[PDB]
PDB file of C-alpha atoms and ligand atoms in Angstrom:
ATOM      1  CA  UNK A   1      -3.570 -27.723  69.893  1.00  0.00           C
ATOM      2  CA  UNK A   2      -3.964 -26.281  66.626  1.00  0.00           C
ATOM      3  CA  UNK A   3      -5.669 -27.870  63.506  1.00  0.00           C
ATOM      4  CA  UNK A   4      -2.405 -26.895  61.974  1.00  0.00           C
ATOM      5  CA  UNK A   5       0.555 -25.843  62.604  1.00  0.00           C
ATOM      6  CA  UNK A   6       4.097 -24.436  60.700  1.00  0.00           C
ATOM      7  CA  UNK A   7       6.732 -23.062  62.735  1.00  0.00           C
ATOM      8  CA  UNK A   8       8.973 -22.102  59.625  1.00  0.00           C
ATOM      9  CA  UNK A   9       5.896 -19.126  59.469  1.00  0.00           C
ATOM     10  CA  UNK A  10       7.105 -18.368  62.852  1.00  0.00           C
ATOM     11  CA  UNK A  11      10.854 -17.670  62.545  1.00  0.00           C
ATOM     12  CA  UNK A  12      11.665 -21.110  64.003  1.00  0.00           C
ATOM     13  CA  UNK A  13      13.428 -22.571  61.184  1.00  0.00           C
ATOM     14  CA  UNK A  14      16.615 -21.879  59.159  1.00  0.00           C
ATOM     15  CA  UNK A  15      17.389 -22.532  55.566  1.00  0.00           C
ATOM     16  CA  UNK A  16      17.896 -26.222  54.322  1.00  0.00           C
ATOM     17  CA  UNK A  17      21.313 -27.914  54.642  1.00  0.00           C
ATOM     18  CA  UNK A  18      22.965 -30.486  52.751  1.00  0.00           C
ATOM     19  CA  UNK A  19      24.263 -32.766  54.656  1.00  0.00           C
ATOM     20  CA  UNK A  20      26.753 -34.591  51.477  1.00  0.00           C
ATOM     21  CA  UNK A  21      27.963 -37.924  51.593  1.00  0.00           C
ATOM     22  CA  UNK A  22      27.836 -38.511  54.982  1.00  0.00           C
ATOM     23  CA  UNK A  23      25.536 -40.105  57.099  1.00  0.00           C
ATOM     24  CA  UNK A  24      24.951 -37.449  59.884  1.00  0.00           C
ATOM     25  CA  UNK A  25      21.414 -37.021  59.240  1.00  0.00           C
ATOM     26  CA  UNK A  26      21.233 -36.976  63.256  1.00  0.00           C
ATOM     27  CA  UNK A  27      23.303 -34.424  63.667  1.00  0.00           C
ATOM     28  CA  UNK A  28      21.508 -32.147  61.340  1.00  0.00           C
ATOM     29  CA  UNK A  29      18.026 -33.151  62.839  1.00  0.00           C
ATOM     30  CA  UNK A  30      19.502 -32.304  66.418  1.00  0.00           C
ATOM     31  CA  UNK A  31      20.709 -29.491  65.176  1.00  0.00           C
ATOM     32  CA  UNK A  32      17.263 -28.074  63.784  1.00  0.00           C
ATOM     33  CA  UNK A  33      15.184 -28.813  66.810  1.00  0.00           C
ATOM     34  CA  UNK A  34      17.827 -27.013  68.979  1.00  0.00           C
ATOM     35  CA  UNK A  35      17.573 -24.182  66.729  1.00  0.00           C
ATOM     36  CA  UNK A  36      13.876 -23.744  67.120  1.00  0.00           C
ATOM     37  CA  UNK A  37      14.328 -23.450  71.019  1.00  0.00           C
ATOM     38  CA  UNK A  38      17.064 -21.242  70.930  1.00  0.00           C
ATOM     39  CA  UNK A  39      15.065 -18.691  68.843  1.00  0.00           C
ATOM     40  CA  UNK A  40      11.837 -19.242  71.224  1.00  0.00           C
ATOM     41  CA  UNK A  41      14.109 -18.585  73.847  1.00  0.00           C
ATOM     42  CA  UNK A  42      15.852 -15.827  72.945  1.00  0.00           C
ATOM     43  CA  UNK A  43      13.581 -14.686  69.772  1.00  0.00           C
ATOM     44  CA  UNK A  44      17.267 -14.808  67.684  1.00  0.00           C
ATOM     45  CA  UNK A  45      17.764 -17.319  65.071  1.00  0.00           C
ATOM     46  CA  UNK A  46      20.831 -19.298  64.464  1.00  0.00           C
ATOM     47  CA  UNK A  47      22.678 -21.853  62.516  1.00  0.00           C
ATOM     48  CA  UNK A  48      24.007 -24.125  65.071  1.00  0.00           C
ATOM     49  CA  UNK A  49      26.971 -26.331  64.216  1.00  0.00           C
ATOM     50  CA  UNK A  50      26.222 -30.144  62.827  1.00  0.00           C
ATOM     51  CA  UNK A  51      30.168 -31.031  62.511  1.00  0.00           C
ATOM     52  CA  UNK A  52      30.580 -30.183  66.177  1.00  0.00           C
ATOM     53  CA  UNK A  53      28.106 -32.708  66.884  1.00  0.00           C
ATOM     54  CA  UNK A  54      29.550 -35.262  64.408  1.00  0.00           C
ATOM     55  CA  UNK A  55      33.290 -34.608  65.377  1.00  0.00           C
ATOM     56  CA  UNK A  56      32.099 -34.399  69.568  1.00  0.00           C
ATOM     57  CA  UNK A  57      29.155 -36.603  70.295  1.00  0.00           C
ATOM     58  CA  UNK A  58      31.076 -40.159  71.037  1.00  0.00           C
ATOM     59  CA  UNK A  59      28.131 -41.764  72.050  1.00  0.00           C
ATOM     60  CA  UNK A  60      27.371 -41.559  68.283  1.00  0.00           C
ATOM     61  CA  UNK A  61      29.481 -43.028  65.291  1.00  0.00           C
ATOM     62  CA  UNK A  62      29.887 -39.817  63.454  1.00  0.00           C
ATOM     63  CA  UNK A  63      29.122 -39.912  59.623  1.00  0.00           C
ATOM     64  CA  UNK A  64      28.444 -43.454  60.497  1.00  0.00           C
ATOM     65  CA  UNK A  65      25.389 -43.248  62.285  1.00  0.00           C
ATOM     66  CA  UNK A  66      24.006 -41.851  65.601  1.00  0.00           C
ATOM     67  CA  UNK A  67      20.642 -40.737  67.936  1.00  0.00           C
ATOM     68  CA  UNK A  68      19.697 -37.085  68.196  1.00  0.00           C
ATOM     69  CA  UNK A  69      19.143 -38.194  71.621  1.00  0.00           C
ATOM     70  CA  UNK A  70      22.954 -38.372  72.624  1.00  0.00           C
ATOM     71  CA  UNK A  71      23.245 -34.981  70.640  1.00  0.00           C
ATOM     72  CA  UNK A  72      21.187 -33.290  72.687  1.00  0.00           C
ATOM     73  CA  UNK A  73      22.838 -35.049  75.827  1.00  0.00           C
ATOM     74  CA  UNK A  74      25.907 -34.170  74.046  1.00  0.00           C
ATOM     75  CA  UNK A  75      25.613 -30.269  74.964  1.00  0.00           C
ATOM     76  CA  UNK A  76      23.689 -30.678  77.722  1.00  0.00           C
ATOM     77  CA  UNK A  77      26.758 -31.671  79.403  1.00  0.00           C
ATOM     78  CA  UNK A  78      29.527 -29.844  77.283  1.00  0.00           C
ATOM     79  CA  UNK A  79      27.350 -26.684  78.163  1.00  0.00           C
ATOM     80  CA  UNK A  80      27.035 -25.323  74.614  1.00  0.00           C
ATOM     81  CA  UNK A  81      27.454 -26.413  70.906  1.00  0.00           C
ATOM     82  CA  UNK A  82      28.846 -24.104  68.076  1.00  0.00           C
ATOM     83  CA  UNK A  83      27.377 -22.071  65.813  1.00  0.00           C
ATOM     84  CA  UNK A  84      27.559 -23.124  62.239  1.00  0.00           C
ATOM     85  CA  UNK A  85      29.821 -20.253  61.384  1.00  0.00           C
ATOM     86  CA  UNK A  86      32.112 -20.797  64.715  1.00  0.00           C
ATOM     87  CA  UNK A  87      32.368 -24.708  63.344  1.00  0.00           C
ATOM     88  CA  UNK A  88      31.725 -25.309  59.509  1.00  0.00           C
ATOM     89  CA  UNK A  89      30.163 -28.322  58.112  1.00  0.00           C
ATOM     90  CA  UNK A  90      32.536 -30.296  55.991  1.00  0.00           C
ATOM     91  CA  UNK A  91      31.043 -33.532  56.612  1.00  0.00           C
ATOM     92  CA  UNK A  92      34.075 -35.770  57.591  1.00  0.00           C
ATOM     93  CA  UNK A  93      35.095 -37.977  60.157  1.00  0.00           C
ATOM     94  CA  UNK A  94      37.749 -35.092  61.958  1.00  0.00           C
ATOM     95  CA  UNK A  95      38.886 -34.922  65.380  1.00  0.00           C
ATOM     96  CA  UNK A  96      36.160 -33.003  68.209  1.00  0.00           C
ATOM     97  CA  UNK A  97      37.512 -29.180  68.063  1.00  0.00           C
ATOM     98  CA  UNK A  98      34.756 -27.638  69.725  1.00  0.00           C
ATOM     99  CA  UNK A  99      35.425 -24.306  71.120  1.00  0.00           C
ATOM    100  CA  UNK A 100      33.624 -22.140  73.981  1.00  0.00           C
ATOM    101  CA  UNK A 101      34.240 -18.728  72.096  1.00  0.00           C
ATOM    102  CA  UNK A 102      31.851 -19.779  69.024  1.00  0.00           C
ATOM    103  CA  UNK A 103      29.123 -21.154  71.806  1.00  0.00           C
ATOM    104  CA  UNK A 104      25.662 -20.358  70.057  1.00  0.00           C
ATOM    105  CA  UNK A 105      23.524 -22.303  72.368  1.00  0.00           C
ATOM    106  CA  UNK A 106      22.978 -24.175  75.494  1.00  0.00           C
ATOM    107  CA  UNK A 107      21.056 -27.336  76.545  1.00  0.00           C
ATOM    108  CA  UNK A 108      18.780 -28.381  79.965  1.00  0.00           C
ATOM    109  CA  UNK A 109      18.450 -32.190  78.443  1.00  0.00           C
ATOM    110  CA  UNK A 110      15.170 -33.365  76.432  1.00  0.00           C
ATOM    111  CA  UNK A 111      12.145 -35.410  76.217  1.00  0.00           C
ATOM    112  CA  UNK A 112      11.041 -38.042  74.402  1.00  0.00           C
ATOM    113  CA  UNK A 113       7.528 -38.356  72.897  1.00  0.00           C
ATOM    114  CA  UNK A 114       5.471 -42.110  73.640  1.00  0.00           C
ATOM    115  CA  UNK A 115       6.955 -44.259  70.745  1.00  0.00           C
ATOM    116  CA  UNK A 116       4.359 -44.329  68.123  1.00  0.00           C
ATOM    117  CA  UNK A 117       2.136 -42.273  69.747  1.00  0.00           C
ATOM    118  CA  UNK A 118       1.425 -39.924  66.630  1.00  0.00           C
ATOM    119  CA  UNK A 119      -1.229 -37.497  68.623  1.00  0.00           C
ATOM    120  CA  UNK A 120       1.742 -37.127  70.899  1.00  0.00           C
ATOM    121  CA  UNK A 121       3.445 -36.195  68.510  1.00  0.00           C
ATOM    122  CA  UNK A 122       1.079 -33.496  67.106  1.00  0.00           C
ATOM    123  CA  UNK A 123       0.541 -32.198  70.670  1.00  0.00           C
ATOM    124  CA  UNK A 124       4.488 -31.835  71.131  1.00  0.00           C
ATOM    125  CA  UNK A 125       4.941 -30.281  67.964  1.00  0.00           C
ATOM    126  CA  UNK A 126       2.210 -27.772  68.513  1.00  0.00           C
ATOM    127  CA  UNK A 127       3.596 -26.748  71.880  1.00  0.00           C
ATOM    128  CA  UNK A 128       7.285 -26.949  71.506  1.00  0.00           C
ATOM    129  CA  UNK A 129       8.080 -26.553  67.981  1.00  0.00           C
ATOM    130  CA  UNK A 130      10.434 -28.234  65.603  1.00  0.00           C
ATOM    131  CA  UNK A 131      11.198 -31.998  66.877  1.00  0.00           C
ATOM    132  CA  UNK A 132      13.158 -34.292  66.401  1.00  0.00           C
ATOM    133  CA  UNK A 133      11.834 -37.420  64.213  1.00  0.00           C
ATOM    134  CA  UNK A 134      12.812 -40.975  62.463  1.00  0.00           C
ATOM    135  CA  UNK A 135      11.663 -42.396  59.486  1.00  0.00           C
ATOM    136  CA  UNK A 136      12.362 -45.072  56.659  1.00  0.00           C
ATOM    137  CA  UNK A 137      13.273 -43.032  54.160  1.00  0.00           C
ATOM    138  CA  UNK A 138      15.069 -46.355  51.982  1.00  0.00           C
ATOM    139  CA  UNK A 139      12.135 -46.204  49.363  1.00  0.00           C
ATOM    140  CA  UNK A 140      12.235 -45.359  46.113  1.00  0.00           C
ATOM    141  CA  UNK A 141       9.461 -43.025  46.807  1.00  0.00           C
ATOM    142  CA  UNK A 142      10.848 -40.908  48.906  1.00  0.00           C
ATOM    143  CA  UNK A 143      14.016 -40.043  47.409  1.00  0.00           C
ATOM    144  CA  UNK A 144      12.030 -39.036  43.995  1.00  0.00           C
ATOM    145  CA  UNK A 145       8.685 -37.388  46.345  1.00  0.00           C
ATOM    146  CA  UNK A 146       8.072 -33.873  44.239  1.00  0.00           C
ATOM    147  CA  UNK A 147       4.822 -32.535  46.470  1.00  0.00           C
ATOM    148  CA  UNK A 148       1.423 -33.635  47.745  1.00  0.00           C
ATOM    149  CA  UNK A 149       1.499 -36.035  51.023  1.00  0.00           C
ATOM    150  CA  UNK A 150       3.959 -39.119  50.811  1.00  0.00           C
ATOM    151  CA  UNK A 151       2.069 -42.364  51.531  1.00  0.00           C
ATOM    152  CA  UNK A 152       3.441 -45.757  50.702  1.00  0.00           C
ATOM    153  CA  UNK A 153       2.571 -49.039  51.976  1.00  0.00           C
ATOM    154  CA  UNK A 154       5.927 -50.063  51.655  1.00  0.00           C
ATOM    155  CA  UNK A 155       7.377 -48.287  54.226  1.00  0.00           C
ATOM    156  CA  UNK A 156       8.711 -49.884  57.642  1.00  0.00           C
ATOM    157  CA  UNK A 157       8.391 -48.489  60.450  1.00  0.00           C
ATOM    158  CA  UNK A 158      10.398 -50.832  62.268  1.00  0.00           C
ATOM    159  CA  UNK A 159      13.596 -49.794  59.699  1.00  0.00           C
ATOM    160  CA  UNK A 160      14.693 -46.303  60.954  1.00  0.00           C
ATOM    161  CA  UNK A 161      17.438 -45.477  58.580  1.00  0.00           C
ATOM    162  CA  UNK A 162      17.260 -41.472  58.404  1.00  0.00           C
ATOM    163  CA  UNK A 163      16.218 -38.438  60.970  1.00  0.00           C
ATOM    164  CA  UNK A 164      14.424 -35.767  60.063  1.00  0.00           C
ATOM    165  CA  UNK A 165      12.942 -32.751  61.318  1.00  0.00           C
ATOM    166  CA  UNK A 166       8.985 -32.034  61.708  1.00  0.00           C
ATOM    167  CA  UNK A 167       7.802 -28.699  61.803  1.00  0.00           C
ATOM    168  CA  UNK A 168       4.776 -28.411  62.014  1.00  0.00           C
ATOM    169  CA  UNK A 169       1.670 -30.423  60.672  1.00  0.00           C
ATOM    170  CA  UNK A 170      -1.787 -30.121  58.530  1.00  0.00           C
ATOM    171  CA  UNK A 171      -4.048 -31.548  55.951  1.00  0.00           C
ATOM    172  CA  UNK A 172      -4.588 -31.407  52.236  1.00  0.00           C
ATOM    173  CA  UNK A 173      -7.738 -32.824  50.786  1.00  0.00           C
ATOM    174  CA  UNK A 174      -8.576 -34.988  53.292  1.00  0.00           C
ATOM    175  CA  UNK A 175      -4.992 -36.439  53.976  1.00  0.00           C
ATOM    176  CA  UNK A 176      -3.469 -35.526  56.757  1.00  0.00           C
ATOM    177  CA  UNK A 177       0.628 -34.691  57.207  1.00  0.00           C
ATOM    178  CA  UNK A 178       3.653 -33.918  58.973  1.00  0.00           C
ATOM    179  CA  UNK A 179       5.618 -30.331  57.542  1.00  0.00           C
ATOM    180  CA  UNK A 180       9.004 -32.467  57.101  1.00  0.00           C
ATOM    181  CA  UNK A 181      12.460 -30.417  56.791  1.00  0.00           C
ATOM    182  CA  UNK A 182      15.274 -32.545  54.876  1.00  0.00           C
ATOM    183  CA  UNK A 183      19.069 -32.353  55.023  1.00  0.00           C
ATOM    184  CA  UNK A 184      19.666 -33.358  51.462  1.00  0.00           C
ATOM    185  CA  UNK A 185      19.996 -29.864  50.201  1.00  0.00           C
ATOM    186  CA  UNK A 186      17.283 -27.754  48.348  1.00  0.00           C
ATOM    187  CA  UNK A 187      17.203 -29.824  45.235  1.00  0.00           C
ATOM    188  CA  UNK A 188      15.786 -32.728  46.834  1.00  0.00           C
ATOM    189  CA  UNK A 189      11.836 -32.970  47.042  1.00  0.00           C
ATOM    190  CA  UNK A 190       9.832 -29.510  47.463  1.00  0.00           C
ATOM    191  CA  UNK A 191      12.722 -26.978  48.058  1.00  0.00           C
ATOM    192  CA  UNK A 192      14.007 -29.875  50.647  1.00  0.00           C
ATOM    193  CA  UNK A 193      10.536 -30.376  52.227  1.00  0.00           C
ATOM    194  CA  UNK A 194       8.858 -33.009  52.186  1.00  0.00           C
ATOM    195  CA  UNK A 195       4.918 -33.950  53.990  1.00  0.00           C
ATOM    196  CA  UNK A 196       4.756 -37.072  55.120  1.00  0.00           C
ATOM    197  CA  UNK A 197       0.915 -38.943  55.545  1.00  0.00           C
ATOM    198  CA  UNK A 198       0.260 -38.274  59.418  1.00  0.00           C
ATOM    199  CA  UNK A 199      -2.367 -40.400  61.334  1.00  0.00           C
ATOM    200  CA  UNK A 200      -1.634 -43.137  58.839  1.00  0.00           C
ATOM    201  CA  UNK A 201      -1.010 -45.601  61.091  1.00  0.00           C
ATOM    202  CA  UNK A 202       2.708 -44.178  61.831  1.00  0.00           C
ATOM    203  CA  UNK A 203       3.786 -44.440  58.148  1.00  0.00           C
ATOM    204  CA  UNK A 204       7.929 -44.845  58.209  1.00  0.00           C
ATOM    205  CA  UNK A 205       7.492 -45.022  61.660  1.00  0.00           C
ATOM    206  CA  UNK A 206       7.597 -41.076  61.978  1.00  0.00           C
ATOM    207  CA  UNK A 207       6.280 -40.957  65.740  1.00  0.00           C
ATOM    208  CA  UNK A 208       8.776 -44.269  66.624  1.00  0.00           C
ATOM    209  CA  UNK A 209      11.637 -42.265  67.600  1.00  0.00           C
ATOM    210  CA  UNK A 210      10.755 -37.971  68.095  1.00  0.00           C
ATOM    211  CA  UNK A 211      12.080 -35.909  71.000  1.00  0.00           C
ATOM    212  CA  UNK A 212      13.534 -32.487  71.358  1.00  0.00           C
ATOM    213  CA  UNK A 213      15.706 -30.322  73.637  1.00  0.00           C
ATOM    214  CA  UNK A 214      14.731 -28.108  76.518  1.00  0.00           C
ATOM    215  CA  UNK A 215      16.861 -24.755  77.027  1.00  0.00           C
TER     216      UNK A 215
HETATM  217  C1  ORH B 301      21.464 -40.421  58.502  1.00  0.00           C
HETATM  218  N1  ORH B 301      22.019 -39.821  57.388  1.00  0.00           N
HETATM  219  C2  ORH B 301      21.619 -41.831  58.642  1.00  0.00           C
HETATM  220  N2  ORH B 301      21.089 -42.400  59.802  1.00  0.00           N
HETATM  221  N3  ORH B 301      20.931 -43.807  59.963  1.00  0.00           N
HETATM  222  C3  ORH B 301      20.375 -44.210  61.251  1.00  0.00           C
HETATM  223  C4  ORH B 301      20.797 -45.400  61.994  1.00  0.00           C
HETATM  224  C5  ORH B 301      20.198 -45.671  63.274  1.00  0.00           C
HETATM  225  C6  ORH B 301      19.221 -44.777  63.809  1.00  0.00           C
HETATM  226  C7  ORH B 301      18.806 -43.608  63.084  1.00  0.00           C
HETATM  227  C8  ORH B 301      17.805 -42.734  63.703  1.00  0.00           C
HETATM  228  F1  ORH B 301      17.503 -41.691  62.941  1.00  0.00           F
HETATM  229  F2  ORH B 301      18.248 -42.305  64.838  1.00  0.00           F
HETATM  230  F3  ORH B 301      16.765 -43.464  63.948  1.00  0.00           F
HETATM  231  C9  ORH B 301      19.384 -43.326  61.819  1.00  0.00           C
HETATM  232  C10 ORH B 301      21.316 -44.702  58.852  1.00  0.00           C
HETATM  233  O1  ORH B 301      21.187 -45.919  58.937  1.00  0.00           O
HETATM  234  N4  ORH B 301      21.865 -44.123  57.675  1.00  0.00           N
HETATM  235  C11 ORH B 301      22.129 -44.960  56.516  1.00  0.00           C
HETATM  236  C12 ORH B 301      21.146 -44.438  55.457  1.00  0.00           C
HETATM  237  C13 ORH B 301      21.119 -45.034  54.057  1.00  0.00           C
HETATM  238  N5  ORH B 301      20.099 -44.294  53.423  1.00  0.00           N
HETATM  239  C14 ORH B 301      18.789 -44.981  53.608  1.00  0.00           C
HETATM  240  C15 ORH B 301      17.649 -44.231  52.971  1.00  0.00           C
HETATM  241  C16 ORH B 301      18.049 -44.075  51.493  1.00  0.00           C
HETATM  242  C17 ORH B 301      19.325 -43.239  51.312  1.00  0.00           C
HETATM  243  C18 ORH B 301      20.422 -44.003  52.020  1.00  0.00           C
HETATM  244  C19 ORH B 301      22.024 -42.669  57.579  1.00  0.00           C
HETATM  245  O2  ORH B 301      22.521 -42.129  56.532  1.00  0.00           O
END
């Protein structure tokens, strides 16, 4: 595995999203790591459809909360989820109105990395690409971080309130971090990016809940 590693410098990873007012942070973390296989797999690059996920995925509550595992399960057995363009984001509680004709992308079912397990992590992200992460993102810190890596010893790793996506990894004088990709829209941290303090002892419990899809 590499020292480092960025898969946005590898066509991987589309454009930051705002996710509003409601709480489907899941579905737009799902959403990226399924994006980053679909281009390895077919070297296109899509937006896949978050609302489909939040309207369709019943084993999640919607804008009320949810796992990027039952996404994934989601169109694993649905064979397919939208493309962003076939299914708009609105970001509302509406009635599942999936259809075939918009499919973007298909699902084989995923993996989950050891909870915790950081080097796991690394080693996941370095061979499959984007995944799928959780963090405590309730501090103060966080929602005002402007650049360098985010460290505070506040941060509880046993409080996963928000899911992110990791692309890739690396080091900055010594401190060592996680390439994070936000849904709060570009006018939230570093162009909505945000590196989080890797090998810190799983700060915000980054490496307590990561998997992503196989295709
Ligand atoms: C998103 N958005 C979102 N997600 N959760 C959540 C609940 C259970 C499990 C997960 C995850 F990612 F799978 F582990 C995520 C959640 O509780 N909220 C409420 C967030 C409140 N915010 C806390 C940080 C500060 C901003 C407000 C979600 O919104």
């Amino acid at each position: 595995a590499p020292d480092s590693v960025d898969y946005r410098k590898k066509g991987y990873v589309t454009p930051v999203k705002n996710q509003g007012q409601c709480g489907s942070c899941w579905a737009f973390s799902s959403v990226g790591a399924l994006e980053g296989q679909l281009k390895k797999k077919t070297g296109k690059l899509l937006n896949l459809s978050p609302q489909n996920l939040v309207d369709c995925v019943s084993e999640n509550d919607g804008c009320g909360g949810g796992y990027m595992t039952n996404a994934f399960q989601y169109v694993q057995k649905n064979r397919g989820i939208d493309s962003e363009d076939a299914y708009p984001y609105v970001g509302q509680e509406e009635s599942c109105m999936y259809n075939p004709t918009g499919k973007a992308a298909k699902c084989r079912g995923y993996r989950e990395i050891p909870e915790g397990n950081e080097k796991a992590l690394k080693r996941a992200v370095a061979r499959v690409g984007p995944v799928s992460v959780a963090i405590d993102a309730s501090l103060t810190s966080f929602q005002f971080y402007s650049k360098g890596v985010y460290y505070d010893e506040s941060c509880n790793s046993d409080n996963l309130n928000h899911a992110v996506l990791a692309v890739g990894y690396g080091i900055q004088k010594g401190n060592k971090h996680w390439i994070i990709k936000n849904s709060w829209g570009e006018n939230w941290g570093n162009k909505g990016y945000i590196l989080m303090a890797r090998n810190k002892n799983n700060a915000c419990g980054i490496a307590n809940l990561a998997s992503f899809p196989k295709m």
